Ligand binder design. Structure first.
Ligand SMILES: COc1ccc(CC[C@H]2OC(=O)[C@@H]3CCCCN3C(=O)[C@@H](C3CCCCC3)c3cc(OC)c(OC)c(c3)OC/C=C/COc3cccc2c3)cc1OC
Length: 128
């Protein structure tokens, strides 16, 4: 990913406009529609710590990742970010700890005050 390019060119998609979630579109999607709260969302993704010491990918489990949009099942940055996505889009998100795991993190994976970077491909979404 290009966290300088996201820092430099990224859209602030936070309510508070505190630059806590910055988005680039890397590939434009084919849908006009973005998902609604409660929609079952299907993605592929890869994520990392900004320090480059831990990694994760949906492919590590050989299946798309599924969550409920806007239900707090995943970090706030995801609920915020995926809500802005069309089917087929690939976006990069640079995420400050206030929109991820904050001061206590989630050890061992997530240190205190960790900045995260994700690539998300929105595959599909379906109501309730
Ligand atoms: C205290 O608050 C929480 C603590 C822990 C969780 C569980 C992790 C949750 O993961 C996420 O929300 C984000 C976004 C969706 C993909 C995974 N993810 C991560 O933060 C990755 C992380 C990316 C950066 C490099 C290190 C790994 C992550 C974090 C974990 O714990 C903090 C994981 O252990 C559970 C982890 C994957 O394991 C693989 C799981 C992947 C997807 O399944 C999830 C299902 C529900 C919630 C999350 C993940 C959720 C929390 O609140 C929402």
């Amino acid at each position: 990913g290009a966290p300088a390019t996201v820092t430099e060119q990224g859209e602030d998609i936070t309510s508070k406009k505190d630059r806590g979630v910055l988005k680039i579109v890397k590939r434009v999607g084919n849908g006009e529609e973005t998902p609604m709260i409660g929609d079952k969302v299907y993605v592929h993704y890869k994520g990392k710590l900004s320090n480059g010491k831990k990694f994760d990918s949906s492919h590590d489990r050989n299946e798309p990742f599924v969550f409920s949009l806007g239900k707090g099942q995943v970090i706030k940055a995801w609920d915020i970010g995926v809500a802005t996505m069309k089917k087929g889009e690939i976006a990069h998100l640079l995420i400050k700890p206030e929109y991820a795991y904050g001061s206590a993190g989630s050890l061992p994976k997530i240190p205190s005050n960790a900045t995260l970077f994700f690539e998300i491909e929105l595959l599909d979404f379906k109501g309730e």
